[PDB]
Design an enzyme around this catalytic site. Structure first.
Site, PDB file in Angstrom:
ATOM      1  N   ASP A 121      20.606  69.064 -16.810  1.00  0.00           N
ATOM      2  CA  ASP A 121      19.618  70.077 -17.189  1.00  0.00           C
ATOM      3  C   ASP A 121      19.059  69.788 -18.597  1.00  0.00           C
ATOM      4  O   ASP A 121      19.824  69.566 -19.562  1.00  0.00           O
ATOM      5  CB  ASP A 121      20.336  71.442 -17.142  1.00  0.00           C
ATOM      6  CG  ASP A 121      19.406  72.604 -16.958  1.00  0.00           C
ATOM      7  OD1 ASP A 121      18.170  72.464 -16.949  1.00  0.00           O
ATOM      8  OD2 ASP A 121      19.919  73.721 -16.828  1.00  0.00           O
ATOM      9  N   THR A 159      14.416  75.257 -14.631  1.00  0.00           N
ATOM     10  CA  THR A 159      15.586  74.697 -13.984  1.00  0.00           C
ATOM     11  C   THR A 159      15.629  74.902 -12.477  1.00  0.00           C
ATOM     12  O   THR A 159      15.702  73.915 -11.743  1.00  0.00           O
ATOM     13  CB  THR A 159      16.858  75.140 -14.681  1.00  0.00           C
ATOM     14  OG1 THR A 159      16.850  74.544 -15.977  1.00  0.00           O
ATOM     15  CG2 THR A 159      18.080  74.583 -13.977  1.00  0.00           C
ATOM     16  N   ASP A 683     -11.548  74.709  -0.505  1.00  0.00           N
ATOM     17  CA  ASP A 683     -10.202  75.222  -0.383  1.00  0.00           C
ATOM     18  C   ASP A 683     -10.254  76.721  -0.765  1.00  0.00           C
ATOM     19  O   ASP A 683      -9.732  77.126  -1.811  1.00  0.00           O
ATOM     20  CB  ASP A 683      -9.220  74.478  -1.294  1.00  0.00           C
ATOM     21  CG  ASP A 683      -7.775  74.808  -0.978  1.00  0.00           C
ATOM     22  OD1 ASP A 683      -7.464  75.265   0.173  1.00  0.00           O
ATOM     23  OD2 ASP A 683      -6.915  74.632  -1.878  1.00  0.00           O
ATOM     24  N   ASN A 685      -8.751  79.340   0.647  1.00  0.00           N
ATOM     25  CA  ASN A 685      -7.446  80.005   0.701  1.00  0.00           C
ATOM     26  C   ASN A 685      -6.426  79.322  -0.227  1.00  0.00           C
ATOM     27  O   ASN A 685      -5.232  79.486  -0.086  1.00  0.00           O
ATOM     28  CB  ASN A 685      -6.950  80.025   2.145  1.00  0.00           C
ATOM     29  CG  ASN A 685      -6.726  78.612   2.672  1.00  0.00           C
ATOM     30  OD1 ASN A 685      -7.054  77.640   1.974  1.00  0.00           O
ATOM     31  ND2 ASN A 685      -6.126  78.484   3.835  1.00  0.00           N
TER      32      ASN A 685
HETATM   33 CA   LIG Z   1      -7.451  75.341   2.353  1.00  0.00          CA
HETATM   34 ZN   LIG Z   2      16.715  75.841 -20.079  1.00  0.00          ZN
END
Ligand SMILES: [Ca+2]
Ligand SMILES: [Zn+2]
Ligand SMILES: *[C@@H]1O[C@H](CO)[C@@H](O[C@@H]2O[C@H](CO)[C@@H](O[C@@H]3O[C@H](CO[C@H]4O[C@H](CO[C@H]5O[C@H](CO)[C@@H](O)[C@H](O)[C@@H]5O)[C@@H](O)[C@H](O[C@H]5O[C@H](CO)[C@@H](O)[C@H](O)[C@@H]5O[C@H]5O[C@H](CO)[C@@H](O)[C@H](O)[C@@H]5O)[C@@H]4O)[C@@H](O)[C@H](O[C@H]4O[C@H](CO)[C@@H](O)[C@H](O)[C@@H]4O[C@H]4O[C@H](CO)[C@@H](O)[C@H](O)[C@@H]4O)[C@@H]3O)[C@H](O)[C@H]2NC(C)=O)[C@H](O)[C@H]1NC(C)=O
Ligand SMILES: CSc1ccc(C(=O)c2c(Cl)cc(Cl)cc2Cl)cc1Cc1ccc(=O)[nH]n1
Ligand SMILES: [Cl-]
Ligand SMILES: [K+]
Length: 804
Positions: A121, A159, A683, A685
């Site tokens: 992380d 994360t 596009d 939607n």
């Molecule tokens: Ca679309």
């Molecule tokens: Zn963090």
């Protein structure tokens, strides 16, 4: 209620989850409050620590010990990881020279090399170089294996969204984990890092790797580790599972570290306190590699060392407060931090107005360190719109800043010096990838790539067929010594017509006019040849794009450009042209300013018309091949054909014209010629996929001419820029964009200045992969080149980020 009075005797870190209220001994039990009474005692032993010492060698086995230095421990699968170093005179893995792993060197019974995902992380990409002195194990993995200079996380660069992307190959908008914190309007529930709600299966869409593996007969270790299980106990559990009998042993394992993220938040990404957590991560990697060497598995297992996002310097005093901008601040809910998401405080309130909120947040201070967006106007490359848990109003926050609702939220709801979450193109959000093992290459650097691609590669590594995902399978083949997946181009679904001259001028009643009747045996033959595609080798360098859906369209040839003209959408799907380094810019002649010409190849019925544009007081028009770049005044007439015309807001025409008049020519100069493919995108939607005809929400007033939501361009040249784009022998170089087709330029705070102070900035913000363009158009590009298909797939996933 759990009958937590059963026992973990024999069952420590069991792989199958037992059903309630029979008590549990697996990884999730701490978090479910459902561990058996003796879990800690039996399963989380700590006595004597994690290391062998000289005086423990050949000891008598004492079951209370955290790990063992007795003679029987190798067989039992439970030595301390440094056992052979201490008691058998062995060397640590990190002190052995690296030797190429040409073939898997596995014990009998291993049907395939195991895969270990070592996940870290907040491991910023630059730690590899900056922390190299205190990370020798990791540096050995990196230089002996395959590594990228960095790996691009998904947006938001938090994360949970990034780990679940790693596990599924899906954009957060598709997998559902759209933030570390989320509110679902249908569940009337909030999801948080802390608490129990996150464990409900309803948040988690797509199909993660452990489930893919299970369903196809490959067994899997747990991916989730409880926070309170220490790292040495997670390493020992993995090495234990690896000693199970063949029928019970998993093939895929994950290790997770909360560091260096946890410290990075406290001390900033390069705080002097960050040296020790990097040392500790390194030591854990040394433990795993020492334990694998003990089990004779260090030339058999494939290890992935991967981060989820990086870490930026972010402090309290760099907070923008919404209360400084709005007056109605108590009517909103803000998801705060390195990104903003705003919704109404109450759904029973009809007064709430997103347009008024957006307006109060746009270009209000000179220094403003955030920018509001309706979610559907966010850069397409972020893929962050198509989910009900993503709020209509979004704030993209400047790197190094935070957004908060009120000051009370910041001093009562400084503590922290680092954070992450920003736009995924930001340097400081980049993270790491190393693969080491028999299936990875030996000592190989590969180009930066996106983490949405690893799911496919981990499926390859395990002989699995991947669930459908947003990776481009084949695009990472260059990571691998031995493939498994051989990509093939999608088949063309619609084949074009090639119309000749079929209509007389007087058949057209389009309300168009052009001053063009100002007109030889040499060049009457030439223009006829051009109309049949004589120059087509020049302008179509990689073959015609393939239409991957059912439709009706015509290929149109011209001296300067080639197009695929949709009879359904009444405009080109793609327009292709090459501009060499030598080519000249000219201007639209005075007499030709409002010129639009009927195309005698295409019926009135399948043409646009000038009258609709006359009537639509909001909507003007532009051209896909620019008149400015015509090769000759005679060739310039071709650019004014009705079939080269597309609807454009006057606000948009500013951006477009600047691109066509100034930037194509600059790029051709710098890159030694460029080939340009441009066209519309629909596009409505906002799902990142091309719209069918029945999804279009806007037409040019009183016509069937649909209005694009976006305009793309793909600009290709030779990677070896000593070769001209039109005669390139080797690898290609591409940059692309998808510009939102908007009736104002509110996005650009300097838009009242000269286009040279703001247009290129906007275009950079909306940089795109060729692959994003493909999903949006149903087209497939680069079908005829001399390059391998794997290389072409890599090229189509490239993103030009404009960072330094
Ligand atoms: Ca679309
Ligand atoms: Zn963090
Ligand atoms: C990135 O990659 C992904 C994955 O490839 C792409 O995402 C996919 O996009 C597809 C096309 O839009 C979409 O197809 C839909 O799916 C509908 C079925 O929905 C559910 O089933 C899915 C399958 O799960 C199973 O998978 C395996 C096999 O693969 C099985 O063995 C298992 O048994 C599995 O269970 C499932 O993925 C999907 O999950 C979503 O919803 C969950 C719960 O609601 C969420 O947890 C999860 O996160 C998913 O949510 C995402 O996707 C939804 C839309 O599905 C979206 O709204 C969310 O915001 C979020 O982004 C479901 O549980 C299917 O019914 C659809 O069919 C309609 O349209 C077609 C068009 O041809 C018609 O033929 C068809 O008859 C039907 O029309 C009818 O319904 C219409 C609208 O409802 C209606 O107007 C009409 O009148 C008709 O009645 C269609 O096939 C995939 O589901 C989707 N998958 C995912 C994970 O997102 C994505 O596009 C890529 N992105 C880019 C940019 O390229
Ligand atoms: C390669 S490590 C990896 C990969 C994917 C996932 C997940 O998809 C996941 C799951 Cl399975 C459950 C939950 Cl609640 C949240 C997430 Cl993000 C989790 C981990 C490790 C982890 C993350 C956080 C933590 O506390 N413990 N362990
Ligand atoms: Cl979030
Ligand atoms: K108009």
């Amino acid at each position: 209620w759990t009958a937590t009075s059963g026992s973990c005797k024999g069952r420590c870190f069991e792989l199958q989850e037992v059903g309630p209220p029979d008590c549990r001994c697996d990884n999730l039990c701490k978090s479910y409050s459902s561990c058996c009474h003796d879990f800690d005692e039996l399963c989380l032993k700590t006595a004597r620590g994690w290391e062998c010492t000289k005086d423990r060698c050949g000891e008598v086995r004492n079951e209370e010990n955290a790990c063992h230095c007795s003679e029987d421990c190798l067989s039992r699968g439970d030595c301390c990881t440094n056992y052979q170093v201490v008691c058998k005179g062995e060397s640590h893995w990190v002190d052995d020279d690296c030797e190429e792993i040409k073939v898997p060197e596995c014990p009998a019974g291993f049907v395939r090399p195991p895969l270990i995902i070592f996940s870290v992380d907040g491991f910023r990409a630059s730690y590899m170089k900056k922390g190299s002195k205190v990370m020798p194990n990791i540096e050995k993995l990196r230089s002996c294996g395959t590594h990228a200079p960095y790996m691009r996380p998904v947006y938001p660069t938090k994360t949970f969204p990034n780990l679940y992307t790693l596990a599924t190959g899906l954009y957060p908008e598709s997998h559902g984990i759209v933030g570390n914190s989320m509110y679902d309007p249908v569940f009337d529930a909030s999801f948080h890092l802390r608490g129990r709600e996150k464990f409900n299966h309803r948040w988690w869409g797509g199909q993660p790797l452990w489930i893919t593996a299970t369903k196809q007969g490959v067994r899997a270790g747990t991916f989730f580790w409880s926070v309170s299980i220490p790292h040495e106990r997670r390493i020992l559990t993995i090495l234990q599972w690896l000693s199970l009998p063949d029928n019970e042993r998993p093939s895929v394992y994950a290790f997770y570290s909360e560091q260096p993220d946890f410290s990075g938040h406290k001390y900033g990404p390069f705080g002097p306190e960050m040296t020790n957590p990097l040392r500790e991560i390194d030591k854990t990697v040394g433990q795993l590699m020492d334990g694998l060497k003990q089990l004779r598995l260090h030339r058999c297992v494939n290890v992935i060392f991967v981060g989820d996002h990086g870490m930026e310097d972010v402090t309290c005093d760099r907070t923008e407060f919404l209360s400084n901008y709005l007056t109605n601040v108590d009517d909103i809910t803000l998801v705060p931090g390195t990104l903003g998401r705003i919704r109404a405080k109450s759904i029973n309130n009809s007064k709430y107005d997103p347009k008024t909120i957006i307006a109060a947040l746009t270009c209000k201070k000179p220094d403003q360190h955030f920018k509001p967006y309706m979610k559907q106007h966010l850069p397409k490359r972020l893929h962050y719109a198509n989910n009900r848990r993503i709020e209509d109003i979004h704030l993209l926050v400047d790197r190094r800043w935070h957004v908060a609702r009120k000051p009370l939220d910041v001093y009562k709801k400084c503590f922290f010096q680092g954070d992450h979450g920003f736009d995924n193109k930001v340097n400081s959000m980049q993270t790491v990838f190393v693969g080491y093992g028999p299936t990875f290459k030996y000592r190989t650097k590969v180009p930066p790539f996106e983490n949405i691609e690893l799911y496919n590669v981990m499926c390859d590594l395990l002989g699995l067929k991947p669930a459908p995902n947003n990776g481009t399978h084949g695009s990472l083949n260059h990571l691998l010594r031995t493939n498994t997946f051989r990509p093939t181009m999608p088949d063309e679904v619609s084949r074009p017509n090639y119309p000749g001259i079929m209509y007389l001028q007087s058949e057209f009643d389009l309300g168009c006019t052009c001053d063009d009747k100002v007109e030889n045996k040499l060049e009457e033959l030439n223009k006829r040849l051009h109309t049949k595609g004589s120059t087509k080798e020049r302008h179509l360098l990689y073959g015609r794009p393939a239409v991957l859906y059912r439709t009706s369209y015509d290929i149109l040839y011209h001296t300067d450009f080639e197009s695929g003209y949709s009879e359904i959408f009444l405009m080109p799907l793609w327009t292709s042209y090459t501009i060499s380094k030598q080519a000249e810019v000219s201007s639209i002649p005075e007499h030709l300013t409002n010129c639009v010409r009927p195309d005698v190849r295409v019926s009135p019925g399948f043409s646009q018309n000038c009258l609709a544009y006359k009537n639509d007081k909001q909507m003007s028009y532009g051209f896909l091949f620019p008149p400015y770049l015509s090769s000759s005044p005679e060739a310039k007439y071709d650019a004014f054909l009705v079939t080269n015309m597309v609807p454009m807001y006057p606000a948009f025409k500013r951006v477009w014209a600047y691109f066509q008049r100034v930037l194509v020519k600059k790029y051709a100069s710098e890159r030694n010629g460029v080939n340009v493919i441009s066209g519309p995108i629909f596009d409505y939607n906002y799902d990142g996929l091309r719209d069918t005809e029945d999804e279009i929400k806007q037409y040019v007033e009183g016509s069937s001419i649909p209005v694009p939501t976006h305009y793309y361009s793909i600009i290709t040249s030779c990677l070896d820029f000593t070769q001209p784009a039109d005669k390139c022998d080797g690898p290609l170089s591409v940059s692309s964009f998808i510009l939102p087709h908007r009736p104002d330029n509110d996005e650009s705070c300097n838009s009242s200045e000269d286009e040279s102070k703001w247009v290129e900035e906007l275009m950079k913000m909306h940089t795109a992969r060729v692959r994003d363009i493909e999903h949006l158009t149903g087209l497939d590009f680069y079908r005829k080149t001399s390059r391998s298909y794997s290389e072409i797939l890599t090229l189509k996933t490239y993103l030009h980020t404009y960072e330094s």
